[PDB]
From a paper:
A key group of these are the respiratory chain supercomplexes (SCs); these which primarily consist of complexes I, III2 and IV (CI, CIII2 and CIV) in varying stoichiometries, which serve as the minimal functional units for NADH:O2 oxidoreduction. Here we report in situ structures of porcine respiratory SCs, determined directly through imaging porcine mitochondria by single-particle analysis combined with cryo-electron tomography (cryo-ET). Our structures, with an average resolution of approximately 2.5 Å and local resolution up to 1.8 Å in the best regions, enable in-depth study of [name] respiratory SCs in their native states. Our in situ structures also capture numerous reactive intermediates within these respiratory supercomplexes, shedding light on the dynamic processes of the ubiquinone/ubiquinol exchange mechanism in complex I and the Q-cycle in complex III.
Numbering used by the authors:
A (entry chain 1b): 1 to 83
B (entry chain 1A): 1 to 115
C (entry chain 1J): 3 to 175
D (entry chain 1e): 1 to 99
E (entry chain 1a): 1 to 70
F (entry chain 1Z): 49 to 144
G (entry chain 1B): 25 to 179
H (entry chain 1H): 2 to 318
Amino acid sequence: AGRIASFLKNAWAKEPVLVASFAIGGLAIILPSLSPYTNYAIRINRATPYNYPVPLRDDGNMPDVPSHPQDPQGPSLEWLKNL
Amino acid sequence: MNIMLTLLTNVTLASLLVLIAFWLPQLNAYSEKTSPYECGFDPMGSARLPFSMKFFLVAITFLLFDLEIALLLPLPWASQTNNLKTMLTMALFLLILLAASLAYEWTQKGLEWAE
Amino acid sequence: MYIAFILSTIFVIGFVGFSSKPSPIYGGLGLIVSGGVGCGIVLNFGGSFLGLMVFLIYLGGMLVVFGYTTAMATEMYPEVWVSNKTVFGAFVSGLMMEFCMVYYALKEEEVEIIFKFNGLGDWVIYDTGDSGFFSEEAMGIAALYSYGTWLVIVTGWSLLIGVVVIMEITRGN
Amino acid sequence: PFFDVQKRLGLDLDRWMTIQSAEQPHKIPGRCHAFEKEWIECAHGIGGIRAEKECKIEFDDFVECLLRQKTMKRLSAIKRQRDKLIKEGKYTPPPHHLG
Amino acid sequence: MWFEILPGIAVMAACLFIPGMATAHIHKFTNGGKEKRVAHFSYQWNLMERDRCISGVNRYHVTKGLENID
Amino acid sequence: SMMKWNRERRRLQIEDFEARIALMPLFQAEKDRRVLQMLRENLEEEAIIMKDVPDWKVGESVFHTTRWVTPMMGELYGLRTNEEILSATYGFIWYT
Amino acid sequence: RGEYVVAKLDDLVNWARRSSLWPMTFGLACCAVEMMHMAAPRYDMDRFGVVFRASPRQSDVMIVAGTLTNKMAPALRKVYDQMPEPRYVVSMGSCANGGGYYHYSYSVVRGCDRIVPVDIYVPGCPPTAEALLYGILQLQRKIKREKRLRIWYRR
Amino acid sequence: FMINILSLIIPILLAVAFLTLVERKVLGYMQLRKGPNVVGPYGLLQPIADALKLVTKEPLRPGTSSISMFIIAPILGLSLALTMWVPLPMPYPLINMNLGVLFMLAMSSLAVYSILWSGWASNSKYALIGALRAVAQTISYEVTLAIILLSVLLMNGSYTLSTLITTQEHIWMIFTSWPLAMMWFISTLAETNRAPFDLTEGESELVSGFNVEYAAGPFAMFFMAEYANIIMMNAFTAILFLGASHDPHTPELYTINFVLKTLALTITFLWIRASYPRFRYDQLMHLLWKSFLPLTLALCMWHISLPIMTASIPPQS
Amino acid sequence: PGIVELPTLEDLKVQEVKVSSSVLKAAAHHYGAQCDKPNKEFMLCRWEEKDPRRCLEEGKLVNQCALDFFRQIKRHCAEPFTEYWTCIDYSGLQLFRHCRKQQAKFDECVLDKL
Amino acid sequence: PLVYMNIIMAFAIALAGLLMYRSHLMSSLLCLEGMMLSLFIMSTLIILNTHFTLANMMPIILLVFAACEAALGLSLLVMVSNTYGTDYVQNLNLLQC
Ligand SMILES: CCCCCCCCCCCCCCCCCC(=O)OC[C@H](COP(=O)([O-])OCC[N+](C)(C)C)OC(=O)CCCCCCCCCCCCCCCCC
Ligand code: SF4
């Protein structure tokens, strides 16, 4: 309590830049755990298509994948459209 | 080859400037003008004696640090991968590793001019 | 084609620049220029990131070696490629060394020395593939933090050990 | 490895690079993905010494795809004899091969 | 009288002018009005060859629209 | 301000990427025809050039396998003109 | 006419010479501090188009200001000879003009001209900042009145 | 095509020449002096007067100098400064360049080599010391400049200079990385060898640093080289942080805005030149390695996780 | 060491769709929606066969189907295409962003006309 | 191809240069440093040719340790230059026995 408060007083008094650089460096490490948009950042990179998704031969029983890029079924990204 | 053309033109244009600044503006040398400068007097005689550094310690750390930054130049492309989780930890890990090396050198003297 | 082979030829006698022991930074002149043209060799094959990297950290690395030469490794009369007779002999022996084979390669294209390789230039060895919207070199380098992982750790940890090693050996009690 | 610590705990340390047809950043193919694939799964679990004579054809073709030296030599024979007779005459270039 | 400073800037500012629009004007001139097409990736560069080939005059910066097809 | 703009810049990029992959089938259908046409064009030329050589199979299988391979571009532009060589082989990299 | 052409190139050469000549940052005695007095914003050395450069390989006109001594003599001649041509010398004050107040002194050479060629002798002890600033002007006029390439044409 | 090259090279030399006038004139007005005004109207003819007189001055070749080494360095200094003007994203860049900053950074390091070689090539104390102070100066700024460079454009998306205009767009980039611009601006001051960090020249300490045996034309190429260097890297910091709007139909609208941005910023470079004493290159590497390096890591860590923080990863294309 | 086979010069010739890249990408979004069945068929052949010489028929289908696509737009509103594709041309990056007004005029033909 | 020949003979003269000391260690140390430049260029040539995306890794990572080898190298030369003064390998023989 007293020791840390005086120590912070001493560091802020002698070399403010170092006690600063330790601060921005300090929380930039623990924000990722607290970040709620990191999952969106994961979804950002997955959504971006570089290789064109070659179609699959349909021998039946794949209701999820559509037969045309107009049917509702299939992975979608309206979260990005809202964002 | 567009970069070659401007590179060739640039070094060419520089060479004309030194070319006509060496032949056109007269020539007259009589030794003491040609002699080295020592603030008016005659040098002790050298300019080749070991001019030993007093900051040799920090020079090598520059090589380690200038080398390691080349390890994090790919960062802008490293951000746009499907695995930013381990990207965040690994890229962070490098910056703490440089920070620790700087902190290590800092505490054990180091950066201050060796006497 | 010229440039691809011509630049590599400059890389050769540039390497003769420092392998012949001139004054140490005249050797520094020797490999800084081949480092410059070495960027060109990888550049023609794509390789822009790697080509700029050597033109980034070699100059950074070669920046201090000059200082050590002029501070703690220079003589009263600095060497040059013409002053000493052995280094001039070392220089010339590095000139007919590749001159015969490039003439041999240009005339026969089937030079056998050590390795067997044909001499139809090097424009052939390129590819017909399409990179799409991603550069192969710049993304393989960027895979450092996605798939390197352990390969990252050994490099970073050694750099720490580097700053320890370069400190204790020069500390002198 | 002398001590295959990789296989013991099952976690990879350096095997991701190793061979050419491993997974690539968003599936960028290699030059010889097909040839290297054929050779690798030819000699799998068969033994290093019991791989040269049997899974050979999948290998020299793969090392051909890597270097393409015999084909470049094939192009050398084409180009050499081309300059041999066109300088002498005979062959006149078709109008698509020179513009 | 710092307004005597401005004549130094006035020519200098005009001196910095020339490489600006010229690099745009020569690009406009050499590409026929439309600006200089850039190709940072294979797709863009593979395009310019196709535009150069389709035009039939061996220029990438001349484009044939819907009238080209029949 | 940067977050909103960066998200928007992304939104255009997938829009641009969507157009690119929409044009892929036509472009791939053109490149393979262009490549295969030219490989045959070399073969038709190769019929008349290979008469003096003692042993030469015209268009023999380059590899021991029969599966098709991507064509080593030396076969493609080997006997073309110099300008066509530099326009594509060294074209991209030398282009600015 | 050839003489017309050479005169035009002559006019180009001296105008650049007299406009852009660079005095040496050389100072010895009482004259030196008054020399930098006129360089102060009151008289504005620079507004006449000149700037102070240090080494001999740098400047145009040597500005000798102060008492010349036997010990100072070897370096002054060395530093003057070290200035590339064209080079001019002006002699500040009575002391540097010749002898000065210490003309009879054992440790003073009677005249900077005894050591280095001189273009203009600016008098006063110390010369007022006005007087030598004219001395620069007189050298501009003297630089104007030359026929270097003109005498070469008729040579 | 070459007409574009001359229109890129020739105006810079005149712009560099007129920098010498304002260097000697705004300083004077900032110094109670009137500046050069005797040569033509208000002195605008003085930069010309300097040019011919320097060219017509006698070139000097010191006896103890290495002749080839003495000549190659001035060529390298001027050529790099001039070729440094090709890749900027000035509305239509001469060469689009994927690694725009790396091209910017690589030869900026090679620029000091001309500064480096001239010191010993002149073969004396006052240039060898100035050359070695160039070593320590680029020991300091180079170890950190790449860190600032990476941090600012990490939100841009890639290393291409052209994408800077797109990235900034609505608001000035300095509004997002103002402590980085604090880092970047005065570190460029430390590479251009200006008043607070001109130890390579060192007017008072060692006569002229890496210039003592240089005379006439070699200086003319050297004087233009470092004047070209400051303007170009100031134009670099102009687009890096203060990039203006660009309308494709009216590219000239960008030029007028960009020119003033790199011009008012240039006036700053002349502004610090008058008001601040000289850093001793002891504290120069001391400061940039004691406070500058530990700080620039922190925002570098800040500027990498933060695109991941708010799902604001910029696109590469 | 064997035989190479190549289709003759006749069956590899189609009525090539000859229109510039900018026009193609200007209508790419609409082209990829409906003119997709030959496209999807074409590179199921490309990825399954892994041999271009075995997919010429699909290449013909996609080339001719795109021609019918370009025939339809040319016939109904050719003029609104003109300003949309020329402003795409003016963009060096062929950016869609500086095209919204022109894109709007194009969009309402094919939605209501076709 | 011929580009490969040029840069492997770059190794050979670098190999000859390294293990041939004439006057001082600094020149040989630089030759050791430049020896990896061919090693860099060598390894870089196959990797872009073969389009193996991952193994673009090692040209940079070879550069980590090759220059790190030089980093301890010229820092070792510091210890010589204090006890020995010069950097001559001919003098570098105090362990004659
Ligand atoms: C939102 C939460 C996260 C926030 C993350 C970001 C950090 C926020 C908090 C800190 C903000 C500021 C950080 C950087 C501070 C500045 C750098 C620094 O270390 O300063 C202290 C340092 C150190 O100060 P010092 O050298 O006096 O030392 C102080 C004593 N010790 C060492 C013990 C600390 O300052 C300098 O290094 C001085 C630099 C001088 C440069 C030349 C003279 C100035 C020239 C004129 C410049 C005018 C402005 C130009 C602007 C141009 C813009 C384009
Ligand atoms: S002339 Fe007068 S003012 Fe000048 S140095 Fe001599 S005593 Fe001093």
